[PDB]
Amino acid sequence: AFQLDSRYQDNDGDLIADIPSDESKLVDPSTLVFAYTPVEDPAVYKEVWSEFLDHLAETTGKNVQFFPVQSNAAQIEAMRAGRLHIAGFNTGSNPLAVACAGFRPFTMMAAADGSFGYEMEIISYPGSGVNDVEDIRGGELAFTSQTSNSGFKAPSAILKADYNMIAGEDFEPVFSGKHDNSILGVANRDYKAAAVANSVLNRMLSRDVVSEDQIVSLYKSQTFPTTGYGIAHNLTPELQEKIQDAFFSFNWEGTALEEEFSKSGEAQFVPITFKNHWEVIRKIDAANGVAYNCR
Ligand SMILES: O=P(O)(O)OC[C@H](O)CO
């Protein structure tokens, strides 16, 4: 099953690229480049992460730079090419980022009680004439991008397995590029149906990007892990430990981070493993024929 790009080794079998032991292959950058996942306009999250990044700079002794990447593909490539050192990758991109960018995931947000996750929802606007999933037949369904779990792969698998509905035969797919573009397009009646992450939906609703009376939910999936956070495999081990320490030592209380992510139920960073927590995502990837051909 799951295979890393041959440019990486997995000598310990945890499915993630091993930290190099050849010192000429390790990087110790004076500026650490961080990127959150482009589920919305990154300008939304610049100040959300600002204090966290200051803590990261203090813990690691490095300068830190927020990279406002606009698409998953550019984010994956930036880490593969060595320009991006720490990232949160959207749920659906974690297997690809692990396989083709040497991403070493180690944490994920969770509620204060340790519970975690988000669901994909299919949404419409009130009065659209699309009043359940079956009503999508013969119409359009807005997807975000093909590396998205909730915005493409999970809804495609569900519509095919449970509603006898395949893109290009039973509905026409359109791509918005981001969850927030999908959700905005629904509320503004550009889209009669979109598959979106309900975590993002809730945070946009709390920030008044859209209003509750503009969105109706028609479907809610099983629960998935949320954004996985990790490090490019080839930073020095000492630096990677300090980055991990920074994540777990950050005090959320009163911060812009807590102000934002409390709106989708998060309060803390917990450890995860790629092998365990992303098994369900690798299965959905496989159900969509995703091959991880880094090219
Ligand atoms: O459904 P995805 O793959 O777009 O992931 C969105 C967020 O990362 C979920 O936390």
Short mmCIF file of C-alpha atoms and ligand atoms in Angstrom, two decimals:
data_model
loop_
_atom_site.label_atom_id
_atom_site.label_comp_id
_atom_site.label_asym_id
_atom_site.label_seq_id
_atom_site.Cartn_x
_atom_site.Cartn_y
_atom_site.Cartn_z
CA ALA A 1 0.00 0.00 0.00
CA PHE A 2 1.08 3.60 0.79
CA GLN A 3 4.55 4.41 -0.57
CA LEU A 4 6.80 7.41 0.01
CA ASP A 5 8.52 8.99 -2.95
CA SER A 6 11.80 7.14 -3.54
CA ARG A 7 13.69 10.29 -2.62
CA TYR A 8 12.75 9.51 1.02
CA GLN A 9 13.51 6.55 3.29
CA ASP A 10 11.18 4.89 5.83
CA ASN A 11 13.57 2.61 7.73
CA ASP A 12 11.27 2.48 10.81
CA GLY A 13 7.99 1.73 9.01
CA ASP A 14 5.85 4.60 10.30
CA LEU A 15 5.13 5.62 6.66
CA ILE A 16 6.74 9.06 7.01
CA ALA A 17 10.07 10.22 5.62
CA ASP A 18 12.93 9.56 8.04
CA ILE A 19 15.06 12.39 9.39
CA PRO A 20 18.40 12.24 7.52
CA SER A 21 21.57 11.20 9.33
CA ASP A 22 23.86 12.65 6.63
CA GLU A 23 24.56 16.13 8.01
CA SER A 24 25.03 17.52 4.51
CA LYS A 25 21.33 16.70 3.97
CA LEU A 26 20.06 18.59 7.04
CA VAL A 27 18.94 22.21 7.06
CA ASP A 28 19.13 24.70 9.92
CA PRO A 29 17.51 27.77 8.37
CA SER A 30 17.88 31.17 9.96
CA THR A 31 14.28 31.93 8.93
CA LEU A 32 11.66 29.22 9.48
CA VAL A 33 8.84 29.46 6.93
CA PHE A 34 5.38 28.50 8.24
CA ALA A 35 2.15 28.03 6.29
CA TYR A 36 -1.37 27.27 7.43
CA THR A 37 -3.68 25.44 5.05
CA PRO A 38 -5.48 27.52 2.35
CA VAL A 39 -9.02 26.57 3.38
CA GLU A 40 -9.80 30.31 3.32
CA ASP A 41 -8.07 33.49 2.20
CA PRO A 42 -4.78 33.36 4.18
CA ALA A 43 -5.26 37.02 5.14
CA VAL A 44 -7.94 35.65 7.52
CA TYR A 45 -5.32 33.60 9.38
CA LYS A 46 -2.27 35.92 9.28
CA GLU A 47 -3.04 37.59 12.62
CA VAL A 48 -4.59 34.37 13.99
CA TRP A 49 -1.15 32.73 13.94
CA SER A 50 0.96 35.84 14.64
CA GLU A 51 1.43 35.30 18.39
CA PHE A 52 1.96 31.55 17.92
CA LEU A 53 4.74 32.35 15.42
CA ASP A 54 6.34 34.80 17.88
CA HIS A 55 6.40 31.97 20.44
CA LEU A 56 7.85 29.66 17.77
CA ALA A 57 10.59 32.22 17.06
CA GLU A 58 11.45 32.48 20.75
CA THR A 59 11.46 28.70 21.30
CA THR A 60 13.62 27.88 18.27
CA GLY A 61 15.82 30.98 18.32
CA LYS A 62 15.00 31.58 14.63
CA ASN A 63 13.20 34.26 12.70
CA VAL A 64 9.77 33.06 11.54
CA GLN A 65 7.88 33.99 8.38
CA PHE A 66 4.20 33.43 7.59
CA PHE A 67 3.80 32.13 4.03
CA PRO A 68 0.29 33.05 2.73
CA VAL A 69 0.12 30.14 0.27
CA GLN A 70 -3.07 30.14 -1.82
CA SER A 71 -3.50 26.51 -2.92
CA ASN A 72 -2.72 23.05 -1.60
CA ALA A 73 -0.63 22.24 -4.68
CA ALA A 74 1.64 25.24 -4.15
CA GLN A 75 1.93 24.39 -0.45
CA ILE A 76 2.97 20.79 -1.13
CA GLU A 77 5.47 21.90 -3.77
CA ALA A 78 6.94 24.58 -1.50
CA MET A 79 7.76 21.99 1.16
CA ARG A 80 9.01 19.41 -1.38
CA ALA A 81 11.33 22.04 -2.88
CA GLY A 82 12.67 23.06 0.54
CA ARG A 83 11.12 26.51 0.85
CA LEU A 84 8.50 25.61 3.51
CA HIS A 85 9.60 24.09 6.83
CA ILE A 86 6.49 23.91 9.06
CA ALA A 87 2.92 23.52 7.87
CA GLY A 88 -0.64 22.65 8.61
CA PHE A 89 -1.84 20.67 5.61
CA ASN A 90 -5.55 20.18 5.05
CA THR A 91 -6.78 16.73 6.05
CA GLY A 92 -7.00 15.44 2.48
CA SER A 93 -3.44 16.55 1.61
CA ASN A 94 -1.67 14.81 4.51
CA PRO A 95 -1.01 11.52 2.62
CA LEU A 96 0.19 13.41 -0.48
CA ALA A 97 2.35 15.79 1.59
CA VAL A 98 3.85 12.83 3.45
CA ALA A 99 4.54 10.91 0.26
CA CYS A 100 5.73 13.70 -2.01
CA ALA A 101 6.97 16.48 0.28
CA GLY A 102 8.62 14.64 3.15
CA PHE A 103 6.08 16.02 5.64
CA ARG A 104 6.53 14.66 9.18
CA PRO A 105 3.12 15.08 10.91
CA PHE A 106 3.01 15.08 14.71
CA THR A 107 0.01 17.09 15.99
CA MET A 108 -3.56 18.17 15.37
CA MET A 109 -6.02 20.41 17.20
CA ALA A 110 -8.52 18.90 19.61
CA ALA A 111 -11.15 20.09 22.07
CA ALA A 112 -10.28 20.46 25.75
CA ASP A 113 -11.69 16.97 26.43
CA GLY A 114 -9.46 15.39 23.74
CA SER A 115 -12.28 14.91 21.22
CA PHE A 116 -11.47 16.06 17.71
CA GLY A 117 -12.47 16.14 14.09
CA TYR A 118 -14.65 17.71 11.46
CA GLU A 119 -17.21 16.46 8.96
CA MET A 120 -17.90 17.14 5.32
CA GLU A 121 -21.28 18.72 4.73
CA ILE A 122 -23.18 19.29 1.50
CA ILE A 123 -24.78 22.73 1.66
CA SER A 124 -27.18 24.78 -0.43
CA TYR A 125 -28.94 28.09 0.07
CA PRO A 126 -32.57 28.32 1.27
CA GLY A 127 -34.96 28.52 -1.65
CA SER A 128 -32.48 27.10 -4.15
CA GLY A 129 -34.77 24.23 -5.12
CA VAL A 130 -32.01 21.85 -3.99
CA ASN A 131 -33.57 20.44 -0.85
CA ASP A 132 -31.71 17.13 -0.41
CA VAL A 133 -28.75 15.30 -1.94
CA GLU A 134 -30.88 13.59 -4.59
CA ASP A 135 -31.92 17.04 -5.88
CA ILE A 136 -28.32 17.53 -7.05
CA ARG A 137 -28.89 15.05 -9.91
CA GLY A 138 -28.80 16.87 -13.23
CA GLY A 139 -27.35 20.01 -11.69
CA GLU A 140 -24.02 21.35 -10.46
CA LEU A 141 -21.91 20.45 -7.44
CA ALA A 142 -19.18 22.84 -6.31
CA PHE A 143 -15.91 21.20 -5.21
CA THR A 144 -12.92 23.07 -3.76
CA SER A 145 -9.81 21.32 -5.15
CA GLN A 146 -8.89 17.73 -5.93
CA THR A 147 -6.57 17.34 -2.91
CA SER A 148 -9.45 18.21 -0.54
CA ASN A 149 -11.04 15.45 1.52
CA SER A 150 -14.34 17.19 2.34
CA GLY A 151 -14.18 19.43 -0.74
CA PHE A 152 -13.79 16.67 -3.36
CA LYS A 153 -12.67 13.13 -2.53
CA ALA A 154 -15.06 12.27 0.33
CA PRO A 155 -18.17 13.70 -1.43
CA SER A 156 -17.23 12.02 -4.71
CA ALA A 157 -16.87 8.63 -2.98
CA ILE A 158 -20.11 9.06 -1.00
CA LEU A 159 -22.18 10.26 -3.97
CA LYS A 160 -20.91 7.31 -6.00
CA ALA A 161 -21.35 4.64 -3.31
CA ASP A 162 -24.61 5.78 -1.68
CA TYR A 163 -26.44 7.98 -4.21
CA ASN A 164 -25.51 6.36 -7.54
CA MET A 165 -24.11 9.68 -8.72
CA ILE A 166 -20.90 10.22 -10.72
CA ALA A 167 -19.44 13.51 -11.92
CA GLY A 168 -19.90 14.05 -15.66
CA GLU A 169 -22.83 11.60 -15.79
CA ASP A 170 -25.24 12.58 -13.00
CA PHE A 171 -23.99 16.08 -12.10
CA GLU A 172 -21.54 18.64 -13.40
CA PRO A 173 -18.55 19.43 -11.16
CA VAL A 174 -17.25 22.96 -10.70
CA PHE A 175 -14.21 23.97 -8.67
CA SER A 176 -14.07 27.03 -6.43
CA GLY A 177 -10.44 26.67 -5.31
CA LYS A 178 -11.15 27.08 -1.57
CA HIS A 179 -13.73 26.17 1.06
CA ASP A 180 -14.46 29.85 1.62
CA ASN A 181 -15.05 30.41 -2.12
CA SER A 182 -17.47 27.45 -2.10
CA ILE A 183 -19.30 28.70 1.02
CA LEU A 184 -19.41 32.30 -0.22
CA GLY A 185 -20.68 31.08 -3.60
CA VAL A 186 -23.49 29.13 -1.96
CA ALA A 187 -24.53 32.06 0.23
CA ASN A 188 -24.37 34.42 -2.76
CA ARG A 189 -26.36 31.88 -4.91
CA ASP A 190 -23.59 31.22 -7.42
CA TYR A 191 -23.74 27.56 -6.35
CA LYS A 192 -26.85 25.55 -5.60
CA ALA A 193 -24.77 22.81 -3.93
CA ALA A 194 -21.27 22.59 -2.44
CA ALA A 195 -19.31 20.04 -0.41
CA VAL A 196 -17.39 21.85 2.32
CA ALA A 197 -15.63 21.39 5.65
CA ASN A 198 -18.06 22.21 8.44
CA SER A 199 -15.22 23.37 10.72
CA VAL A 200 -14.40 26.11 8.20
CA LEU A 201 -18.12 26.83 7.75
CA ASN A 202 -18.56 27.39 11.50
CA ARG A 203 -15.55 29.69 11.77
CA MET A 204 -16.72 31.75 8.78
CA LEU A 205 -20.19 32.01 10.30
CA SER A 206 -18.73 33.21 13.59
CA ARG A 207 -16.63 35.83 11.75
CA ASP A 208 -19.78 36.98 9.85
CA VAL A 209 -18.31 36.08 6.44
CA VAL A 210 -21.68 34.47 5.73
CA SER A 211 -24.91 34.42 7.77
CA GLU A 212 -26.72 31.35 9.16
CA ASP A 213 -29.86 32.23 7.23
CA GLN A 214 -27.89 31.93 3.96
CA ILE A 215 -26.78 28.27 4.34
CA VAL A 216 -28.78 25.06 4.70
CA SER A 217 -27.07 21.70 5.32
CA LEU A 218 -28.26 18.67 3.35
CA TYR A 219 -25.76 16.02 4.48
CA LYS A 220 -23.14 15.39 7.14
CA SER A 221 -20.40 12.78 6.76
CA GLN A 222 -18.49 10.66 9.25
CA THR A 223 -15.90 12.47 11.38
CA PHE A 224 -12.36 12.96 10.02
CA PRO A 225 -9.15 14.25 11.63
CA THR A 226 -8.66 17.98 11.17
CA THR A 227 -5.59 19.79 9.79
CA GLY A 228 -2.36 17.92 10.53
CA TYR A 229 0.70 19.94 11.54
CA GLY A 230 4.24 18.85 10.92
CA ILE A 231 7.75 19.55 9.76
CA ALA A 232 9.82 19.00 6.63
CA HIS A 233 11.77 15.80 7.29
CA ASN A 234 15.27 17.26 6.75
CA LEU A 235 15.49 19.93 9.44
CA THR A 236 18.07 19.03 12.06
CA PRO A 237 16.60 16.75 14.76
CA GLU A 238 17.42 19.32 17.43
CA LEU A 239 15.48 22.02 15.57
CA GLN A 240 12.57 19.65 14.93
CA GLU A 241 12.32 18.91 18.67
CA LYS A 242 12.20 22.63 19.45
CA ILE A 243 9.45 23.20 16.86
CA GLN A 244 7.40 20.38 18.40
CA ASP A 245 8.03 21.80 21.88
CA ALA A 246 6.82 25.20 20.65
CA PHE A 247 3.49 23.75 19.51
CA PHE A 248 2.84 22.02 22.82
CA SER A 249 4.07 24.84 25.09
CA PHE A 250 2.04 27.63 23.46
CA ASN A 251 -0.48 29.09 25.93
CA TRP A 252 -3.76 29.59 24.02
CA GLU A 253 -5.44 31.69 26.72
CA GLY A 254 -6.61 35.07 25.44
CA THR A 255 -4.85 34.66 22.10
CA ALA A 256 -6.07 35.25 18.55
CA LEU A 257 -5.41 31.55 17.95
CA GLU A 258 -7.92 30.57 20.63
CA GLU A 259 -10.36 33.26 19.48
CA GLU A 260 -10.48 31.70 16.00
CA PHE A 261 -10.17 27.97 16.54
CA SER A 262 -12.54 27.88 19.52
CA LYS A 263 -15.21 28.60 16.93
CA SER A 264 -14.81 25.11 15.49
CA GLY A 265 -14.40 23.56 18.92
CA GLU A 266 -10.62 23.46 19.37
CA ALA A 267 -8.66 24.27 22.53
CA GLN A 268 -5.28 22.47 22.35
CA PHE A 269 -2.72 20.57 20.26
CA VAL A 270 -2.63 16.79 20.83
CA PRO A 271 -0.18 14.22 19.42
CA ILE A 272 -1.29 12.17 16.43
CA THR A 273 0.30 9.58 14.20
CA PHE A 274 -0.06 9.59 10.43
CA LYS A 275 -0.37 5.79 10.40
CA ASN A 276 -3.34 5.78 12.82
CA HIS A 277 -5.25 9.05 12.50
CA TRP A 278 -5.07 9.26 8.68
CA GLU A 279 -6.00 5.63 7.89
CA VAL A 280 -9.56 6.70 7.02
CA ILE A 281 -8.19 9.39 4.71
CA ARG A 282 -5.84 7.01 2.90
CA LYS A 283 -8.86 4.76 2.30
CA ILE A 284 -10.84 7.65 0.82
CA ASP A 285 -7.80 8.56 -1.31
CA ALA A 286 -7.67 4.97 -2.55
CA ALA A 287 -11.40 4.95 -3.29
CA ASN A 288 -10.72 7.94 -5.58
CA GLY A 289 -7.75 6.31 -7.32
CA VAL A 290 -5.18 8.71 -5.84
CA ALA A 291 -1.71 7.36 -6.63
CA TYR A 292 0.76 9.83 -5.02
CA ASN A 293 2.79 10.11 -8.25
CA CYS A 294 5.12 12.90 -7.14
CA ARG A 295 6.07 12.99 -10.93
O1 LIG B 1 -11.40 18.56 3.91
P1 LIG B 1 -10.02 19.12 3.64
O2 LIG B 1 -9.12 18.08 3.07
O3 LIG B 1 -10.15 20.29 2.71
O4 LIG B 1 -9.46 19.66 5.08
C1 LIG B 1 -9.99 20.86 5.59
C2 LIG B 1 -9.40 21.10 6.98
O5 LIG B 1 -8.02 20.84 6.98
C3 LIG B 1 -10.02 20.13 7.99
O6 LIG B 1 -9.51 20.45 9.25
#
